[PDB]
Amino acid sequence: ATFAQALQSVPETQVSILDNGLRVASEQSSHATCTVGVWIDAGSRYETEKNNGAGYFLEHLAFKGTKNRPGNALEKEVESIGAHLNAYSTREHTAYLIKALSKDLPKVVELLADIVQNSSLEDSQIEKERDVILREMQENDASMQNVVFDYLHATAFQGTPLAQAVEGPSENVRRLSRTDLTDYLNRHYKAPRMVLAAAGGVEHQQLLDLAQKHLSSVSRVYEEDAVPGLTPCRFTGSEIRHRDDALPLAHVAIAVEGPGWANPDNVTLQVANAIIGHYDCTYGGGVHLSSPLASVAVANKLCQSFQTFNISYSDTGLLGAHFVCDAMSIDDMVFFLQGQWMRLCTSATESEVTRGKNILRNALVSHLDGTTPVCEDIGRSLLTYGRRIPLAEWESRIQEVDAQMLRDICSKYFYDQCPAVAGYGPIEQLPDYNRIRSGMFWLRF
Amino acid sequence: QPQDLEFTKLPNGLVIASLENYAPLSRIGLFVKAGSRYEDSNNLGTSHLLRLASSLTTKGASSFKITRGIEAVGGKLSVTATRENMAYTVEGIRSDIEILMEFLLNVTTAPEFRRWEVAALRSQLKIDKAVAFQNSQTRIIENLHDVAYKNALANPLYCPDYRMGKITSEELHYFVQNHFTSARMALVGLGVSHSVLKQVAEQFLNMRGGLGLAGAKAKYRGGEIREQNGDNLVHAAIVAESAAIGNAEANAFSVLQHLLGAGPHIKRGNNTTSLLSQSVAKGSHQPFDVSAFNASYSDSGLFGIYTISQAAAAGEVINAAYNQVKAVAQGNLSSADVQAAKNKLKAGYLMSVETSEGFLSEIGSQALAAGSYMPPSTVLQQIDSVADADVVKAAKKFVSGKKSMAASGNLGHTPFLDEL
Amino acid sequence: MLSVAARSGPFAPVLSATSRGVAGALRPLLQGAVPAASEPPVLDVKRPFLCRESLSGQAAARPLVATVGLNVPASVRF
Amino acid sequence: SKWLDGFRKWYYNAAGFNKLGLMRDDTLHETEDVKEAIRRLPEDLYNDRMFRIKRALDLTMRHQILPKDQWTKYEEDKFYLEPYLKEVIRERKEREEWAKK
């Protein structure tokens, strides 16, 4: 009745391949519900600056009508069976999720196959969703955190398809037509780039039979052998500063180049992110927080909040910290965050590393509690690693993590590296890039 | 016993529920009937300061020791507070769950409540209320309860600005010693042994008194308030009295809420089966969001309509929503739509129970309210046992009942209660 | 007697608001002074809802749940 | 012993802070832990402590002492800051133990 025994008692996933290469994966639980989703390896990484909003348009237009059930018949069927439907898209992935009861699995998989195969793109719906997309980009402009992460991505991956956002620029939204959307569907919605993931009260034999029934006609071949190709994205050290002094608070995100999805240093770097920690002003820990950055933030009343991120893409990524503070604490927060990063780089402590390992174990297992995060992790794992990494394997890697290799990996990725800095708001006290570099190396080590 | 939920009741009124699901992380929750509803006008905000005082120095563990030990384990200390009851939850690896129970029971049974700690904590109380009142729905429903009840449910879930700076350690001690007793508590646990939970219960919870203070029965008043704050959007909630927890009338009200529309099932969807969304979109071309609000408690309930509309079209949106509910009360509904509403309610309940945190919250709420565990099969059975004539009766009750209205925004065109 | 002062005796300076844009030769009793009122905290602005699709789901349908934690952000559930 | 009490009283008279109306906790030097204890003091004890220190500074300015009847005595010299200071020391020791571990 220990942690490793419970993680072994976690039931393993089942992965099968259709005749066209479409991956079909499932995790069976005792829940009376299920989450069935379709993951497509497509996004802004694959978009080529001319149809940069095509995936986001298809995210909007995927449920507004199809060939078999046009108009609102799809919504009527979904709300009749009681399913909750979701869709999202990041720069590398596009996911369509349906959470329903376990008995409605054939209807759910038929709806998903109809959505991802026979989507109808009516021109009036294209115009309506174009206006809706323009207004929602206006809302995201009026948002604050998404702006600075988009700025960070742009200034970190300038000149590469990773800089362009998921929504795409406004003139491109006004410029796309139905031909570009159909070209995106015929180019990026191929059979071996989809994983049909199911989690909950589903049988893998039933799921595979339904996938063979519905999703066996995808036309994995290309039009004129127009096979796309992944290319490495050049990270650069840079800064973008959108100064607008009328805003109440300042958002600053500082990151370095990540290791990628398949790099085994991600576990150690996530442990280090657990060492640095995240803090929000509505916390109950106070000054006695175990995270030293959070403790000094509470003690000096510096920032409203901070968080640490490790976003990973194919052999690349952004790894760093994002904080919101006032206009008179940006330099102090930068100094303290960089000092904590180099304390991790130079003098790592075994007790704090054990604390971070426990935090990370709790993080993965409490995230994987739930059928729709299980299905989400199945989709991401089969799209990135090519397999589902089990909880026992994650725990084994975490046990392999100790203070010495944490010190080595942190020195490899943080120490003396040119960062990407994105600032939005009253960022006059945000230090110069040369000062940020001078914080990125230490004179005592 | 992974097959069934172990359940027992001590002679002192405490309830212990346990489950051996062999989960990698176990959850321990003490659910206490000590919400904001158990305060009169003299100690308002005491529950809020308690909710933020769940990490202070205690008789057995200091605040530093509690924080450092919890985050060294990696577990989560969380407090979930409603008007009716509060919930203290620790989550963590089953190897450290004994330390987690020790910290949890130390912070929920014997708190020292030093004056300097609460004096430093009241600023955090102000900040927490500001963050909670960032979004307009919190303020709307606080105002709605304030004008819907005379007492015992109109007490705000957050501390009033005048009570900020005046809540004292003796007030906190009085509230704890009167409402944190054994008969008003339930110790539930997922991933822990029932025997171990029994030992920690008999080691920490035998020194509390009994039934404690009763309450004030939550008398209804009705009425309205309007807060003009120049928002771009007008938020208006119009409710009336409904059934309490444990009634087939309350089940009918839940089915009616899911018939009228309790949220979107599709991202960026049109809400096709939502009657109020269809009725408002029939005669509007502006951004809107209309839904049915349902909130039942131990002794009273509130059912009504919530509209977020434009300033100019607020009257049309509210009148269309009220006309849709009046048509439902007259009987303009189909059995297929009732079946779809029941399917929506069953699915929503099942995905609520789906998450282990939600499962723990559900079993703890059942242990506090009924004192026994009702299986989800029985819950779905009674949801299916809800009839459509009961839905018509609930809609007629909301139509004929006295109204409580909370509105905010730019109220130049929002109608009054006598204008509906 | 058609005046607020002639109708409401003790409620004249409550129903009426008097401000002297130029200070007179005689000062009145109870000059009045604000006791250095505090400021609401500087805090993040929420996104607006300029479209119906993002507006959908914002209407409250369940009673309040206030969640706080040792190291988790405080959440408000409707 | 019985001789220890009388000799302690004689030392208390010889120290001379009773002649200016002080107390032992008033006289002890304000370190960081003492600052935390004074911050943890209640309002009334803080007000009498600050008045006693101010009167002491006034008497030292005049190079005068209080009259013999107005001197504080060894019997009534209450130890008001002692539990607060002990609690602050205990919290600091716990923090140092956690930093060592």
Side-chain angles (χ1 to χ4, degrees):
Chain A
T2 185
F3 196 47
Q5 184 178 2
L7 291 177
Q8 273 313 339
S9 177
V10 176
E12 69 269 61
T13 185
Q14 302 209 41
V15 182
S16 64
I17 313 295
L18 279 189
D19 62 343
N20 42 42
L22 190 136
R23 297 205 265 285
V24 175
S26 69
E27 171 154 340
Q28 182 171 352
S29 177
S30 65
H31 292 119
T33 56
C34 78
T35 300
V36 190
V38 172
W39 267 258
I40 297 89
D41 208 332
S44 306
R45 183 77 170 275
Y46 300 84
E47 272 147 5
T48 67
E49 182 156 340
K50 191 176 177 68
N51 48 353
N52 190 211
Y56 198 67
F57 263 91
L58 275 158
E59 199 202 83
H60 275 60
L61 274 180
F63 314 82
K64 299 312 204 317
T66 45
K67 300 294 187 291
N68 198 289
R69 35 188 65 90
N72 50 63
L74 192 140
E75 305 185 331
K76 282 162 127 203
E77 279 197 314
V78 162
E79 288 166 19
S80 306
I81 73 176
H84 285 84
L85 179 136
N86 190 15
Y88 64 100
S89 54
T90 187
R91 287 164 167 90
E92 268 199 336
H93 301 122
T94 302
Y96 304 103
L97 282 163
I98 292 184
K99 301 159 54 50
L101 304 196
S102 66
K103 66 180 180 181
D104 304 331
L105 173 73
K107 186 43 71 174
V108 162
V109 73
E110 183 169 34
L111 280 159
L112 280 177
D114 166 67
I115 281 155
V116 309
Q117 282 187 160
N118 290 318
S119 184
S120 89
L121 299 174
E122 198 258 330
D123 62 358
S124 88
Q125 268 283 348
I126 292 173
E127 297 289 307
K128 291 177 70 68
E129 294 306 312
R130 156 174 300 122
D131 289 332
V132 163
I133 278 173
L134 281 171
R135 264 150 50 230
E136 161 178 285
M137 301 205 318
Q138 203 174 320
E139 286 185 37
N140 292 338
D141 293 327
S143 172
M144 192 76 148
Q145 160 175 4
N146 306 115
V147 176
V148 72
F149 280 101
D150 281 348
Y151 283 173
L152 178 74
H153 270 90
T155 197
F157 299 119
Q158 52 186 103
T160 59
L162 263 183
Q164 48 198 2
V166 190
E167 302 87 37
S170 74
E171 69 275 16
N172 189 179
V173 175
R174 284 186 290 271
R175 184 251 311 290
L176 301 173
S177 196
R178 198 198 182 259
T179 54
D180 303 64
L181 297 191
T182 52
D183 286 330
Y184 192 86
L185 282 178
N186 290 318
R187 190 147 198 263
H188 298 78
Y189 276 36
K190 290 320 197 189
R193 318 201 60 72
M194 302 162 219
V195 181
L196 174 68
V202 295
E203 185 215 20
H204 187 76
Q205 195 41 65
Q206 190 192 10
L207 181 78
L208 186 49
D209 282 345
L210 287 162
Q212 180 65 44
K213 182 177 184 295
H214 288 126
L215 283 146
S216 55
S217 75
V218 184
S219 82
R220 65 179 176 88
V221 305
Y222 291 94
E223 300 102 298
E224 294 109 328
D225 283 334
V227 183
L230 277 296
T231 179
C233 305
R234 167 197 59 197
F235 186 90
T236 179
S238 65
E239 71 176 350
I240 177 177
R241 314 159 87 83
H242 191 167
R243 184 176 178 179
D244 195 355
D245 270 322
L247 301 180
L249 295 163
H251 280 232
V252 172
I254 297 183
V256 301
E257 185 172 354
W261 276 110
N263 206 305
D265 303 350
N266 281 284
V267 183
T268 71
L269 284 160
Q270 276 143 6
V271 173
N273 275 353
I275 309 310
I276 304 288
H278 55 281
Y279 158 77
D280 173 21
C281 53
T282 79
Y283 272 17
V287 67
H288 302 323
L289 275 169
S290 67
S291 173
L293 191 54
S295 168
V296 70
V298 174
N300 299 22
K301 283 88 173 162
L302 287 178
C303 67
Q304 183 196 5
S305 69
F306 63 91
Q307 60 157 317
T308 54
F309 54 90
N310 168 48
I311 308 166
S312 288
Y313 313 108
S314 289
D315 64 89
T316 184
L318 280 168
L319 188 153
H322 164 265
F323 54 94
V324 64
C325 61
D326 46 340
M328 293 316 268
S329 302
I330 318 182
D331 62 358
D332 310 283
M333 274 285 308
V334 160
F335 159 74
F336 279 124
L337 160 74
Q338 288 186 328
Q340 279 328 293
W341 271 344
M342 311 276 258
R343 205 197 34 95
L344 267 189
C345 276
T346 61
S347 85
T349 300
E350 194 41 77
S351 56
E352 88 187 316
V353 163
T354 307
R355 179 185 102 234
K357 284 186 297 190
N358 287 311
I359 285 171
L360 184 63
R361 292 156 165 142
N362 277 42
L364 283 70
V365 181
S366 184
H367 197 294
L368 272 296
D369 169 51
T371 74
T372 187
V374 161
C375 168
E376 194 264 338
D377 199 70
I378 286 170
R380 264 181 310 101
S381 304
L382 275 73
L383 273 196
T384 47
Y385 317 119
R387 66 184 180 93
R388 170 101 184 279
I389 303 185
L391 275 298
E393 198 158 322
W394 285 119
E395 170 63 341
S396 176
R397 295 188 203 276
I398 286 174
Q399 286 276 42
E400 287 178 359
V401 171
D402 61 86
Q404 188 41 64
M405 64 183 73
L406 196 146
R407 189 177 298 112
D408 305 312
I409 291 314
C410 277
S411 180
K412 177 160 72 176
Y413 285 104
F414 275 121
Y415 195 93
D416 206 5
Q417 297 301 103
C418 297
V421 186
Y424 184 60
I427 50 179
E428 197 187 22
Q429 208 166 95
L430 165 76
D432 203 82
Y433 192 84
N434 287 322
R435 304 296 292 264
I436 289 176
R437 204 66 178 74
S438 294
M440 270 304 128
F441 69 93
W442 269 358
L443 293 180
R444 65 178 64 88
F445 173 68
Chain B
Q1 297 293 323
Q3 271 65 78
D4 53 58
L5 201 82
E6 315 204 42
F7 210 94
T8 192
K9 185 177 288 188
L10 290 194
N12 47 49
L14 191 75
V15 176
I16 294 93
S18 198
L19 182 64
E20 276 288 335
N21 57 352
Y22 291 170
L25 281 71
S26 43
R27 296 180 141 268
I28 297 283
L30 188 61
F31 290 23
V32 54
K33 274 178 304 214
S36 176
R37 91 157 283 153
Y38 301 105
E39 303 167 350
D40 47 3
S41 70
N42 290 302
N43 56 354
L44 287 178
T46 315
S47 64
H48 192 193
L49 199 45
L50 196 63
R51 192 200 318 152
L52 301 188
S54 81
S55 161
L56 290 191
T57 313
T58 52
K59 301 150 46 160
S62 76
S63 54
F64 180 84
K65 183 167 178 278
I66 281 179
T67 306
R68 291 317 196 85
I70 284 177
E71 315 166 350
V73 161
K76 288 310 193 242
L77 185 62
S78 64
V79 187
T80 289
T82 70
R83 258 161 182 89
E84 287 290 326
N85 45 6
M86 292 185 58
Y88 293 97
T89 312
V90 285
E91 190 175 39
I93 303 167
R94 50 169 57 247
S95 68
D96 304 330
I97 201 56
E98 209 64 36
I99 297 101
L100 286 182
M101 281 166 249
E102 181 178 0
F103 275 4
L104 177 68
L105 277 296
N106 275 317
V107 73
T108 196
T109 58
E112 202 161 358
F113 287 141
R114 297 157 178 205
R115 312 174 282 98
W116 42 99
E117 311 207 298
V118 301
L121 188 56
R122 290 183 292 231
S123 63
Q124 190 48 61
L125 192 80
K126 176 208 188 43
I127 293 172
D128 185 30
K129 187 188 179 182
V131 174
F133 275 2
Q134 202 74 70
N135 44 4
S136 314
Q137 296 95 332
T138 311
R139 196 173 308 96
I140 287 295
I141 308 299
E142 290 288 89
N143 285 345
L144 190 74
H145 281 86
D146 192 23
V147 292
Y149 294 100
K150 286 177 193 176
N151 66 50
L153 272 172
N155 306 323
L157 205 63
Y158 301 96
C159 171
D161 306 66
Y162 89 96
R163 279 295 289 180
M164 273 182 224
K166 294 162 32 53
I167 313 180
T168 58
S169 174
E170 58 266 16
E171 284 172 358
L172 287 178
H173 275 300
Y174 186 85
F175 192 81
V176 166
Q177 79 158 62
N178 282 310
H179 305 104
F180 268 63
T181 67
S182 65
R184 321 156 62 88
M185 266 172 191
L187 180 59
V188 290
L190 304 179
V192 292
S193 198
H194 191 81
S195 295
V196 178
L197 211 51
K198 174 71 172 66
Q199 307 319 135
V200 74
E202 67 93 19
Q203 204 268 326
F204 263 103
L205 275 172
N206 308 340
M207 60 79 71
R208 312 307 316 247
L211 277 296
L213 264 72
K217 185 43 42 193
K219 292 198 309 302
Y220 187 84
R221 58 174 272 206
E224 73 167 20
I225 49 186
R226 299 154 69 90
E227 202 196 279
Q228 176 141 0
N229 51 6
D231 298 351
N232 290 318
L233 292 199
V234 171
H235 298 245
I238 296 93
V239 296
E241 200 171 6
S242 83
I245 300 299
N247 292 51
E249 296 201 20
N251 279 300
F253 266 109
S254 63
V255 173
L256 173 58
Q257 175 203 6
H258 274 100
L259 167 64
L260 298 181
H265 287 84
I266 283 175
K267 187 200 216 202
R268 311 178 182 103
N270 288 325
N271 315 275
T272 316
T273 62
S274 172
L275 286 190
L276 279 81
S277 280
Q278 258 190 320
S279 67
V280 175
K282 182 174 72 68
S284 174
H285 65 279
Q286 287 279 272
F288 69 94
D289 178 30
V290 58
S291 75
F293 179 81
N294 190 16
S296 289
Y297 304 103
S298 60
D299 45 356
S300 60
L302 287 184
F303 182 81
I305 53 170
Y306 198 105
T307 69
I308 311 172
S309 43
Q310 290 290 321
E316 281 145 0
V317 165
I318 290 160
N319 275 302
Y322 198 63
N323 274 355
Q324 189 47 67
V325 184
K326 282 197 286 187
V328 172
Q330 286 172 1
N332 301 151
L333 77 166
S334 63
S335 163
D337 211 354
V338 169
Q339 202 53 60
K342 286 198 233 191
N343 294 357
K344 289 176 185 178
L345 176 61
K346 289 156 85 169
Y349 174 71
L350 279 190
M351 323 178 194
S352 69
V353 178
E354 170 170 282
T355 303
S356 81
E357 153 179 4
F359 182 51
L360 187 72
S361 279
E362 171 47 10
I363 62 180
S365 298
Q366 285 204 11
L368 275 189
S372 56
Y373 176 55
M374 185 180 288
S377 55
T378 310
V379 179
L380 302 191
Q381 188 274 331
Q382 72 186 17
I383 284 168
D384 295 345
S385 165
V386 180
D388 57 356
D390 298 326
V391 179
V392 178
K393 284 195 286 183
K396 286 204 236 158
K397 204 207 174 86
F398 165 68
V399 160
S400 56
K402 199 159 145 44
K403 300 283 187 296
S404 305
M405 171 183 202
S408 177
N410 189 8
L411 305 155
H413 304 262
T414 315
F416 292 83
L417 271 180
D418 63 89
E419 308 186 353
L420 289 189
Chain C
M1 65 179 288
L2 195 153
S3 175
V4 288
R7 293 211 101 91
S8 299
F11 303 104
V14 185
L15 300 181
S16 176
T18 295
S19 74
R20 34 211 180 281
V22 182
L26 283 163
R27 56 159 288 274
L29 275 297
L30 196 64
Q31 279 162 127
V34 298
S38 66
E39 197 68 35
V42 176
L43 199 83
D44 268 332
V45 65
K46 195 59 70 176
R47 64 174 71 241
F49 306 97
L50 294 174
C51 65
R52 184 211 100 211
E53 285 84 2
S54 45
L55 191 43
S56 176
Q58 283 324 280
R62 294 145 292 264
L64 274 294
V65 164
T67 317
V68 302
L70 197 60
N71 48 355
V72 65
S75 86
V76 193
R77 195 301 301 281
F78 313 111
Chain D
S1 181
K2 271 78 67 178
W3 186 87
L4 190 69
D5 190 21
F7 178 56
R8 271 206 181 125
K9 279 201 43 184
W10 177 87
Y11 179 83
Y12 180 78
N13 290 318
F17 61 92
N18 68 327
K19 298 171 168 92
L20 310 172
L22 278 297
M23 301 187 151
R24 187 205 55 181
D25 300 304
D26 287 352
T27 45
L28 61 83
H29 167 54
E30 201 166 300
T31 66
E32 297 293 326
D33 291 331
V34 182
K35 283 174 185 177
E36 294 293 328
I38 297 169
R39 215 193 50 76
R40 277 173 199 211
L41 266 179
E43 281 76 1
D44 62 358
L45 289 185
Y46 182 62
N47 292 329
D48 304 78
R49 162 179 208 276
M50 299 289 299
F51 168 65
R52 277 189 314 248
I53 297 169
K54 197 190 168 113
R55 187 185 51 190
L57 293 152
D58 169 45
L59 289 167
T60 293
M61 182 179 72
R62 264 91 61 81
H63 301 288
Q64 282 196 239
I65 56 174
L66 276 176
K68 173 105 181 63
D69 45 307
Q70 207 171 7
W71 290 353
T72 181
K73 303 124 181 173
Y74 184 100
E75 291 46 50
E76 51 185 59
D77 203 316
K78 305 325 302 172
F79 295 157
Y80 66 96
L81 204 59
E82 203 207 330
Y84 303 115
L85 200 48
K86 273 165 53 54
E87 183 65 39
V88 172
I89 293 317
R90 215 150 50 82
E91 284 163 38
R92 204 261 311 290
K93 287 303 143 72
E94 193 166 49
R95 287 203 303 272
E96 294 294 328
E97 210 57 41
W98 196 274
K100 286 155 45 191
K101 181 173 71 69

